[PDB]
PDB file of C-alpha atoms in Angstrom:
ATOM      1  CA  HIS A   1     -37.431 110.977 234.096  1.00  0.00           C
ATOM      2  CA  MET A   2     -38.756 114.272 235.541  1.00  0.00           C
ATOM      3  CA  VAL A   3     -42.358 114.771 234.254  1.00  0.00           C
ATOM      4  CA  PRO A   4     -45.474 116.759 235.155  1.00  0.00           C
ATOM      5  CA  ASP A   5     -47.871 115.185 237.634  1.00  0.00           C
ATOM      6  CA  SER A   6     -51.231 114.042 236.433  1.00  0.00           C
ATOM      7  CA  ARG A   7     -54.641 112.988 237.589  1.00  0.00           C
ATOM      8  CA  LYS A   8     -57.030 110.100 236.941  1.00  0.00           C
ATOM      9  CA  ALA A   9     -60.685 110.068 236.022  1.00  0.00           C
ATOM     10  CA  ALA A  10     -63.185 107.533 234.707  1.00  0.00           C
ATOM     11  CA  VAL A  11     -66.746 106.777 233.756  1.00  0.00           C
ATOM     12  CA  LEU A  12     -68.539 104.094 235.781  1.00  0.00           C
ATOM     13  CA  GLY A  13     -71.583 102.179 234.611  1.00  0.00           C
ATOM     14  CA  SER A  14     -72.952  99.133 232.819  1.00  0.00           C
ATOM     15  CA  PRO A  15     -73.119  98.911 229.904  1.00  0.00           C
ATOM     16  CA  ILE A  16     -70.203 101.298 229.531  1.00  0.00           C
ATOM     17  CA  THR A  17     -69.439 101.285 225.781  1.00  0.00           C
ATOM     18  CA  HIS A  18     -71.866 104.002 224.631  1.00  0.00           C
ATOM     19  CA  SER A  19     -70.679 106.749 226.958  1.00  0.00           C
ATOM     20  CA  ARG A  20     -68.999 109.687 225.263  1.00  0.00           C
ATOM     21  CA  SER A  21     -67.505 110.881 228.528  1.00  0.00           C
ATOM     22  CA  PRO A  22     -63.959 109.582 227.870  1.00  0.00           C
ATOM     23  CA  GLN A  23     -63.866 111.267 224.466  1.00  0.00           C
ATOM     24  CA  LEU A  24     -65.185 114.614 225.597  1.00  0.00           C
ATOM     25  CA  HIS A  25     -62.951 114.696 228.670  1.00  0.00           C
ATOM     26  CA  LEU A  26     -59.738 113.688 226.881  1.00  0.00           C
ATOM     27  CA  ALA A  27     -60.479 116.254 224.150  1.00  0.00           C
ATOM     28  CA  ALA A  28     -60.864 118.842 226.902  1.00  0.00           C
ATOM     29  CA  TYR A  29     -57.786 117.857 228.857  1.00  0.00           C
ATOM     30  CA  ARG A  30     -55.619 118.005 225.735  1.00  0.00           C
ATOM     31  CA  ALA A  31     -57.002 121.485 224.882  1.00  0.00           C
ATOM     32  CA  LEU A  32     -56.325 122.581 228.501  1.00  0.00           C
ATOM     33  CA  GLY A  33     -52.694 121.454 228.383  1.00  0.00           C
ATOM     34  CA  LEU A  34     -53.193 118.366 230.553  1.00  0.00           C
ATOM     35  CA  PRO A  35     -52.244 115.632 228.070  1.00  0.00           C
ATOM     36  CA  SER A  36     -51.103 113.131 230.698  1.00  0.00           C
ATOM     37  CA  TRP A  37     -54.377 113.021 232.636  1.00  0.00           C
ATOM     38  CA  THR A  38     -56.130 109.724 232.051  1.00  0.00           C
ATOM     39  CA  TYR A  39     -59.820 108.911 231.588  1.00  0.00           C
ATOM     40  CA  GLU A  40     -60.907 105.304 231.520  1.00  0.00           C
ATOM     41  CA  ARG A  41     -64.071 103.182 231.267  1.00  0.00           C
ATOM     42  CA  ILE A  42     -64.892 100.990 234.230  1.00  0.00           C
ATOM     43  CA  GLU A  43     -67.750  98.528 234.051  1.00  0.00           C
ATOM     44  CA  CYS A  44     -69.522  98.917 237.400  1.00  0.00           C
ATOM     45  CA  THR A  45     -72.916  97.876 238.816  1.00  0.00           C
ATOM     46  CA  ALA A  46     -74.827  99.971 241.387  1.00  0.00           C
ATOM     47  CA  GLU A  47     -73.820  97.438 243.993  1.00  0.00           C
ATOM     48  CA  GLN A  48     -70.128  97.632 243.084  1.00  0.00           C
ATOM     49  CA  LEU A  49     -69.823 101.403 242.994  1.00  0.00           C
ATOM     50  CA  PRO A  50     -69.332 102.298 246.682  1.00  0.00           C
ATOM     51  CA  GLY A  51     -66.523  99.758 247.134  1.00  0.00           C
ATOM     52  CA  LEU A  52     -64.876 100.807 243.905  1.00  0.00           C
ATOM     53  CA  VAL A  53     -64.825 104.547 244.692  1.00  0.00           C
ATOM     54  CA  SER A  54     -63.900 103.984 248.348  1.00  0.00           C
ATOM     55  CA  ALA A  55     -60.655 102.334 247.295  1.00  0.00           C
ATOM     56  CA  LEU A  56     -59.440 105.100 244.946  1.00  0.00           C
ATOM     57  CA  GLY A  57     -56.280 106.947 245.925  1.00  0.00           C
ATOM     58  CA  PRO A  58     -55.731 110.726 246.002  1.00  0.00           C
ATOM     59  CA  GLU A  59     -54.683 110.838 242.336  1.00  0.00           C
ATOM     60  CA  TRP A  60     -58.333 110.258 241.356  1.00  0.00           C
ATOM     61  CA  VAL A  61     -59.812 113.664 240.714  1.00  0.00           C
ATOM     62  CA  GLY A  62     -63.303 112.916 239.361  1.00  0.00           C
ATOM     63  CA  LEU A  63     -65.731 110.316 238.058  1.00  0.00           C
ATOM     64  CA  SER A  64     -68.598 110.418 235.625  1.00  0.00           C
ATOM     65  CA  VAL A  65     -71.334 107.947 236.511  1.00  0.00           C
ATOM     66  CA  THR A  66     -73.909 106.559 234.151  1.00  0.00           C
ATOM     67  CA  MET A  67     -76.661 103.898 234.416  1.00  0.00           C
ATOM     68  CA  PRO A  68     -77.129 101.919 236.647  1.00  0.00           C
ATOM     69  CA  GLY A  69     -74.989 103.738 239.197  1.00  0.00           C
ATOM     70  CA  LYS A  70     -76.422 107.229 239.603  1.00  0.00           C
ATOM     71  CA  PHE A  71     -78.451 106.540 242.778  1.00  0.00           C
ATOM     72  CA  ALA A  72     -75.530 104.685 244.294  1.00  0.00           C
ATOM     73  CA  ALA A  73     -73.238 107.598 243.534  1.00  0.00           C
ATOM     74  CA  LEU A  74     -75.495 110.024 245.382  1.00  0.00           C
ATOM     75  CA  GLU A  75     -75.640 107.642 248.374  1.00  0.00           C
ATOM     76  CA  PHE A  76     -71.890 107.052 248.367  1.00  0.00           C
ATOM     77  CA  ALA A  77     -70.777 110.700 248.372  1.00  0.00           C
ATOM     78  CA  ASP A  78     -70.058 112.372 251.656  1.00  0.00           C
ATOM     79  CA  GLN A  79     -71.137 115.753 250.169  1.00  0.00           C
ATOM     80  CA  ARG A  80     -73.796 116.485 247.574  1.00  0.00           C
ATOM     81  CA  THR A  81     -75.120 119.466 245.762  1.00  0.00           C
ATOM     82  CA  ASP A  82     -78.666 120.614 246.419  1.00  0.00           C
ATOM     83  CA  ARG A  83     -79.613 119.966 242.788  1.00  0.00           C
ATOM     84  CA  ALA A  84     -78.327 116.340 242.912  1.00  0.00           C
ATOM     85  CA  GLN A  85     -80.458 115.779 246.022  1.00  0.00           C
ATOM     86  CA  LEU A  86     -83.470 117.320 244.273  1.00  0.00           C
ATOM     87  CA  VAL A  87     -83.042 115.163 241.135  1.00  0.00           C
ATOM     88  CA  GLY A  88     -82.492 112.153 243.389  1.00  0.00           C
ATOM     89  CA  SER A  89     -79.336 110.866 241.648  1.00  0.00           C
ATOM     90  CA  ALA A  90     -75.796 111.914 240.689  1.00  0.00           C
ATOM     91  CA  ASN A  91     -73.888 111.538 237.439  1.00  0.00           C
ATOM     92  CA  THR A  92     -70.710 113.168 238.793  1.00  0.00           C
ATOM     93  CA  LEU A  93     -68.346 112.561 241.701  1.00  0.00           C
ATOM     94  CA  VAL A  94     -65.694 115.166 242.371  1.00  0.00           C
ATOM     95  CA  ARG A  95     -62.764 114.812 244.757  1.00  0.00           C
ATOM     96  CA  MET A  96     -62.779 117.606 247.376  1.00  0.00           C
ATOM     97  CA  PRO A  97     -59.584 119.406 248.375  1.00  0.00           C
ATOM     98  CA  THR A  98     -59.427 117.643 251.750  1.00  0.00           C
ATOM     99  CA  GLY A  99     -60.426 114.167 250.698  1.00  0.00           C
ATOM    100  CA  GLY A 100     -64.185 113.795 250.417  1.00  0.00           C
ATOM    101  CA  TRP A 101     -66.222 113.037 247.332  1.00  0.00           C
ATOM    102  CA  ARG A 102     -68.892 115.489 246.249  1.00  0.00           C
ATOM    103  CA  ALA A 103     -71.871 114.274 244.200  1.00  0.00           C
ATOM    104  CA  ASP A 104     -73.445 116.469 241.548  1.00  0.00           C
ATOM    105  CA  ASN A 105     -75.916 116.058 238.735  1.00  0.00           C
ATOM    106  CA  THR A 106     -74.807 117.693 235.507  1.00  0.00           C
ATOM    107  CA  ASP A 107     -77.619 116.041 233.493  1.00  0.00           C
ATOM    108  CA  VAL A 108     -79.434 119.165 234.738  1.00  0.00           C
ATOM    109  CA  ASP A 109     -76.867 121.313 232.867  1.00  0.00           C
ATOM    110  CA  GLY A 110     -77.408 119.127 229.809  1.00  0.00           C
ATOM    111  CA  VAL A 111     -80.965 120.402 229.566  1.00  0.00           C
ATOM    112  CA  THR A 112     -80.522 123.994 230.843  1.00  0.00           C
ATOM    113  CA  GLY A 113     -77.474 124.458 228.608  1.00  0.00           C
ATOM    114  CA  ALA A 114     -78.978 122.845 225.490  1.00  0.00           C
ATOM    115  CA  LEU A 115     -82.291 124.683 225.695  1.00  0.00           C
ATOM    116  CA  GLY A 116     -81.093 128.078 226.911  1.00  0.00           C
ATOM    117  CA  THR A 117     -84.585 129.075 228.078  1.00  0.00           C
ATOM    118  CA  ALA A 118     -87.867 127.185 228.054  1.00  0.00           C
ATOM    119  CA  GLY A 119     -90.288 130.138 228.345  1.00  0.00           C
ATOM    120  CA  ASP A 120     -93.200 129.921 230.760  1.00  0.00           C
ATOM    121  CA  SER A 121     -94.849 126.599 229.893  1.00  0.00           C
ATOM    122  CA  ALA A 122     -92.779 123.479 229.138  1.00  0.00           C
ATOM    123  CA  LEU A 123     -93.577 119.863 228.332  1.00  0.00           C
ATOM    124  CA  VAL A 124     -91.592 116.776 229.302  1.00  0.00           C
ATOM    125  CA  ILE A 125     -92.428 113.976 226.864  1.00  0.00           C
ATOM    126  CA  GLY A 126     -92.090 110.607 228.636  1.00  0.00           C
ATOM    127  CA  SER A 127     -91.798 109.449 232.243  1.00  0.00           C
ATOM    128  CA  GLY A 128     -88.689 107.273 232.230  1.00  0.00           C
ATOM    129  CA  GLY A 129     -85.362 107.419 234.042  1.00  0.00           C
ATOM    130  CA  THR A 130     -84.149 110.667 232.442  1.00  0.00           C
ATOM    131  CA  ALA A 131     -87.299 112.610 233.160  1.00  0.00           C
ATOM    132  CA  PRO A 132     -86.382 113.757 236.743  1.00  0.00           C
ATOM    133  CA  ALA A 133     -83.347 115.656 235.525  1.00  0.00           C
ATOM    134  CA  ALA A 134     -85.450 117.248 232.787  1.00  0.00           C
ATOM    135  CA  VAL A 135     -88.060 118.401 235.391  1.00  0.00           C
ATOM    136  CA  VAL A 136     -85.440 119.897 237.739  1.00  0.00           C
ATOM    137  CA  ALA A 137     -83.723 121.610 234.776  1.00  0.00           C
ATOM    138  CA  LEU A 138     -86.974 123.130 233.575  1.00  0.00           C
ATOM    139  CA  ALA A 139     -87.654 124.438 237.077  1.00  0.00           C
ATOM    140  CA  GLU A 140     -84.113 125.895 237.108  1.00  0.00           C
ATOM    141  CA  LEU A 141     -84.904 127.637 233.790  1.00  0.00           C
ATOM    142  CA  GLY A 142     -87.690 129.476 235.660  1.00  0.00           C
ATOM    143  CA  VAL A 143     -90.625 127.891 233.821  1.00  0.00           C
ATOM    144  CA  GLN A 144     -93.936 128.587 235.457  1.00  0.00           C
ATOM    145  CA  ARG A 145     -95.605 125.253 234.509  1.00  0.00           C
ATOM    146  CA  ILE A 146     -94.225 121.795 233.701  1.00  0.00           C
ATOM    147  CA  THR A 147     -96.614 119.365 232.027  1.00  0.00           C
ATOM    148  CA  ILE A 148     -95.656 115.670 231.942  1.00  0.00           C
ATOM    149  CA  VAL A 149     -96.874 114.226 228.625  1.00  0.00           C
ATOM    150  CA  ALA A 150     -96.819 110.504 229.074  1.00  0.00           C
ATOM    151  CA  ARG A 151     -98.899 107.345 228.939  1.00  0.00           C
ATOM    152  CA  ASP A 152     -98.519 106.098 232.505  1.00  0.00           C
ATOM    153  CA  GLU A 153    -100.375 108.281 234.986  1.00  0.00           C
ATOM    154  CA  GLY A 154     -98.605 106.691 237.963  1.00  0.00           C
ATOM    155  CA  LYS A 155     -95.086 107.445 236.711  1.00  0.00           C
ATOM    156  CA  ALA A 156     -96.228 110.841 235.602  1.00  0.00           C
ATOM    157  CA  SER A 157     -97.673 111.740 239.012  1.00  0.00           C
ATOM    158  CA  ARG A 158     -94.332 111.285 240.658  1.00  0.00           C
ATOM    159  CA  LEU A 159     -92.790 113.753 238.166  1.00  0.00           C
ATOM    160  CA  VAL A 160     -95.651 116.175 238.766  1.00  0.00           C
ATOM    161  CA  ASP A 161     -94.874 115.966 242.492  1.00  0.00           C
ATOM    162  CA  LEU A 162     -91.224 116.702 241.733  1.00  0.00           C
ATOM    163  CA  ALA A 163     -92.149 119.694 239.579  1.00  0.00           C
ATOM    164  CA  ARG A 164     -94.137 121.113 242.453  1.00  0.00           C
ATOM    165  CA  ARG A 165     -91.357 120.435 244.977  1.00  0.00           C
ATOM    166  CA  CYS A 166     -89.095 122.442 242.641  1.00  0.00           C
ATOM    167  CA  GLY A 167     -91.489 125.405 242.931  1.00  0.00           C
ATOM    168  CA  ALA A 168     -93.297 125.155 239.570  1.00  0.00           C
ATOM    169  CA  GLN A 169     -96.899 124.305 238.696  1.00  0.00           C
ATOM    170  CA  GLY A 170     -97.238 120.781 237.379  1.00  0.00           C
ATOM    171  CA  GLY A 171     -99.694 118.395 235.843  1.00  0.00           C
ATOM    172  CA  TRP A 172    -100.109 115.313 233.673  1.00  0.00           C
ATOM    173  CA  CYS A 173    -101.323 115.110 230.090  1.00  0.00           C
ATOM    174  CA  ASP A 174    -102.059 111.650 228.594  1.00  0.00           C
ATOM    175  CA  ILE A 175     -99.923 111.495 225.452  1.00  0.00           C
ATOM    176  CA  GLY A 176    -102.658 109.434 223.822  1.00  0.00           C
ATOM    177  CA  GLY A 177    -105.542 111.633 224.933  1.00  0.00           C
ATOM    178  CA  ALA A 178    -107.675 114.596 223.921  1.00  0.00           C
ATOM    179  CA  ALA A 179    -105.802 117.086 226.127  1.00  0.00           C
ATOM    180  CA  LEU A 180    -102.537 117.011 224.191  1.00  0.00           C
ATOM    181  CA  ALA A 181    -103.560 119.633 221.621  1.00  0.00           C
ATOM    182  CA  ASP A 182    -104.243 122.227 224.293  1.00  0.00           C
ATOM    183  CA  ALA A 183    -100.956 121.422 226.106  1.00  0.00           C
ATOM    184  CA  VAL A 184     -99.064 121.894 222.846  1.00  0.00           C
ATOM    185  CA  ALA A 185    -100.942 125.080 221.961  1.00  0.00           C
ATOM    186  CA  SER A 186     -99.856 126.802 225.161  1.00  0.00           C
ATOM    187  CA  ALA A 187     -96.342 125.309 225.333  1.00  0.00           C
ATOM    188  CA  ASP A 188     -93.165 127.364 224.797  1.00  0.00           C
ATOM    189  CA  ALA A 189     -90.770 124.441 224.800  1.00  0.00           C
ATOM    190  CA  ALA A 190     -90.515 120.677 225.233  1.00  0.00           C
ATOM    191  CA  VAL A 191     -87.913 118.106 226.226  1.00  0.00           C
ATOM    192  CA  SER A 192     -88.565 114.754 224.601  1.00  0.00           C
ATOM    193  CA  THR A 193     -87.052 111.845 226.529  1.00  0.00           C
ATOM    194  CA  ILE A 194     -88.525 108.919 224.565  1.00  0.00           C
ATOM    195  CA  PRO A 195     -87.107 106.951 221.617  1.00  0.00           C
ATOM    196  CA  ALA A 196     -87.488 108.375 218.123  1.00  0.00           C
ATOM    197  CA  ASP A 197     -89.829 105.595 216.923  1.00  0.00           C
ATOM    198  CA  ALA A 198     -92.142 106.200 219.902  1.00  0.00           C
ATOM    199  CA  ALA A 199     -92.078 109.995 219.432  1.00  0.00           C
ATOM    200  CA  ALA A 200     -92.749 109.684 215.676  1.00  0.00           C
ATOM    201  CA  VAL A 201     -96.329 108.580 216.446  1.00  0.00           C
ATOM    202  CA  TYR A 202     -96.916 111.995 218.052  1.00  0.00           C
ATOM    203  CA  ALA A 203     -94.659 114.122 215.865  1.00  0.00           C
ATOM    204  CA  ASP A 204     -97.465 115.917 214.029  1.00  0.00           C
ATOM    205  CA  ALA A 205     -99.298 116.571 217.302  1.00  0.00           C
ATOM    206  CA  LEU A 206     -96.079 117.956 218.900  1.00  0.00           C
ATOM    207  CA  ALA A 207     -95.037 119.928 215.797  1.00  0.00           C
ATOM    208  CA  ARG A 208     -96.376 123.222 217.011  1.00  0.00           C
ATOM    209  CA  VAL A 209     -94.212 123.384 220.147  1.00  0.00           C
ATOM    210  CA  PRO A 210     -91.928 126.299 219.215  1.00  0.00           C
ATOM    211  CA  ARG A 211     -88.639 124.882 220.583  1.00  0.00           C
ATOM    212  CA  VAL A 212     -88.032 121.190 221.154  1.00  0.00           C
ATOM    213  CA  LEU A 213     -85.003 119.530 222.757  1.00  0.00           C
ATOM    214  CA  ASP A 214     -84.948 115.937 221.566  1.00  0.00           C
ATOM    215  CA  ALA A 215     -82.734 113.647 223.695  1.00  0.00           C
ATOM    216  CA  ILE A 216     -82.239 111.483 220.596  1.00  0.00           C
ATOM    217  CA  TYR A 217     -79.435 112.355 218.201  1.00  0.00           C
ATOM    218  CA  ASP A 218     -79.081 109.324 215.967  1.00  0.00           C
ATOM    219  CA  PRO A 219     -80.350 109.310 213.350  1.00  0.00           C
ATOM    220  CA  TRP A 220     -80.910 113.076 212.894  1.00  0.00           C
ATOM    221  CA  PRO A 221     -83.253 114.717 212.181  1.00  0.00           C
ATOM    222  CA  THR A 222     -85.731 112.488 213.960  1.00  0.00           C
ATOM    223  CA  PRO A 223     -89.367 112.385 212.791  1.00  0.00           C
ATOM    224  CA  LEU A 224     -90.180 114.649 215.739  1.00  0.00           C
ATOM    225  CA  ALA A 225     -87.486 117.160 214.709  1.00  0.00           C
ATOM    226  CA  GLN A 226     -88.632 117.089 211.115  1.00  0.00           C
ATOM    227  CA  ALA A 227     -92.187 117.920 212.069  1.00  0.00           C
ATOM    228  CA  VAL A 228     -91.130 120.714 214.396  1.00  0.00           C
ATOM    229  CA  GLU A 229     -88.904 122.200 211.700  1.00  0.00           C
ATOM    230  CA  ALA A 230     -91.619 121.879 209.040  1.00  0.00           C
ATOM    231  CA  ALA A 231     -93.893 123.846 211.422  1.00  0.00           C
ATOM    232  CA  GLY A 232     -91.377 126.687 211.639  1.00  0.00           C
ATOM    233  CA  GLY A 233     -89.901 125.718 214.982  1.00  0.00           C
ATOM    234  CA  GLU A 234     -86.454 124.905 216.319  1.00  0.00           C
ATOM    235  CA  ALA A 235     -85.274 121.391 217.054  1.00  0.00           C
ATOM    236  CA  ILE A 236     -82.146 120.735 219.143  1.00  0.00           C
ATOM    237  CA  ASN A 237     -80.680 117.227 219.507  1.00  0.00           C
ATOM    238  CA  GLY A 238     -79.266 115.201 222.356  1.00  0.00           C
ATOM    239  CA  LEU A 239     -75.614 115.830 221.457  1.00  0.00           C
ATOM    240  CA  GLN A 240     -76.121 119.280 222.988  1.00  0.00           C
ATOM    241  CA  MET A 241     -77.262 117.662 226.272  1.00  0.00           C
ATOM    242  CA  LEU A 242     -74.105 115.477 226.258  1.00  0.00           C
ATOM    243  CA  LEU A 243     -71.949 118.543 225.513  1.00  0.00           C
ATOM    244  CA  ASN A 244     -73.374 120.640 228.321  1.00  0.00           C
ATOM    245  CA  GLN A 245     -73.251 117.718 230.813  1.00  0.00           C
ATOM    246  CA  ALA A 246     -69.558 117.414 230.076  1.00  0.00           C
ATOM    247  CA  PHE A 247     -68.732 121.162 230.264  1.00  0.00           C
ATOM    248  CA  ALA A 248     -69.686 121.161 233.907  1.00  0.00           C
ATOM    249  CA  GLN A 249     -67.714 118.008 234.785  1.00  0.00           C
ATOM    250  CA  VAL A 250     -64.579 119.299 233.035  1.00  0.00           C
ATOM    251  CA  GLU A 251     -64.774 122.579 234.959  1.00  0.00           C
ATOM    252  CA  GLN A 252     -65.227 120.829 238.299  1.00  0.00           C
ATOM    253  CA  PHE A 253     -62.440 118.292 237.679  1.00  0.00           C
ATOM    254  CA  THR A 254     -59.832 120.734 236.281  1.00  0.00           C
ATOM    255  CA  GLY A 255     -60.751 124.044 237.853  1.00  0.00           C
ATOM    256  CA  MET A 256     -60.462 125.616 234.378  1.00  0.00           C
ATOM    257  CA  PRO A 257     -63.150 127.057 232.055  1.00  0.00           C
ATOM    258  CA  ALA A 258     -64.420 124.398 229.636  1.00  0.00           C
ATOM    259  CA  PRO A 259     -62.603 124.528 226.264  1.00  0.00           C
ATOM    260  CA  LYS A 260     -65.868 124.638 224.402  1.00  0.00           C
ATOM    261  CA  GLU A 261     -64.705 124.625 220.765  1.00  0.00           C
ATOM    262  CA  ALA A 262     -62.352 121.707 221.443  1.00  0.00           C
ATOM    263  CA  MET A 263     -65.202 119.755 223.080  1.00  0.00           C
ATOM    264  CA  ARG A 264     -67.548 120.573 220.189  1.00  0.00           C
ATOM    265  CA  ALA A 265     -64.949 119.116 217.806  1.00  0.00           C
ATOM    266  CA  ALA A 266     -65.198 115.827 219.740  1.00  0.00           C
ATOM    267  CA  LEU A 267     -68.994 115.765 219.871  1.00  0.00           C
ATOM    268  CA  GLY A 268     -70.793 112.904 218.095  1.00  0.00           C
TER     269      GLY A 268
END
């Protein structure tokens, strides 16, 4: 009954059925020659997360964390990356060689990896819970200006503040207002964080942004993507954010380069 040792990982959150993390990680571990590592789903509230992680034994190598637990994960960890602190939340907990848990935010990699570059002037469409990672990612892509295109000036102002704390210029553009055309005319890229049916209202107005990362991937192409493509631009969907989020977790958990083709085969 001599067998190789193995490690345990999981995704924590609630609801926990939509996450693709188990699929992408098991596809990676099998490609990396670690077929006995396990990756489970654990339903977990923000309030439950610290007690849950605190009790895990040394065989637990890493956790992915999704809503509603990302703030709690950052607070729980005894070490955190600078970019997780800057985003203000963590979607990743990695066991350290000598026992601690390190928090990171690879949602940032989702956007930097999916987009590649965002040029000099980038838009974030929306002001909801995924917008902070988009802002920090755009700043990490070296954009000079981040414009928050959203309806709620209050939620937008907090993202403008974050853009500036990241070193970029920032400002707000009312999605429903007269200033949108000028924001689009000078934009090099956009990240759209809102649902497809909400973005469809503004698809023609956003069509001229040359490169658009749409967080939505089902159905595809979205109305937004269709307009961008009809205008000669490039539309990228949210599966590429999920892919690039996962690359970084797999590398941190296994210490091996991400098996990218194997993970692409599991993407959907």
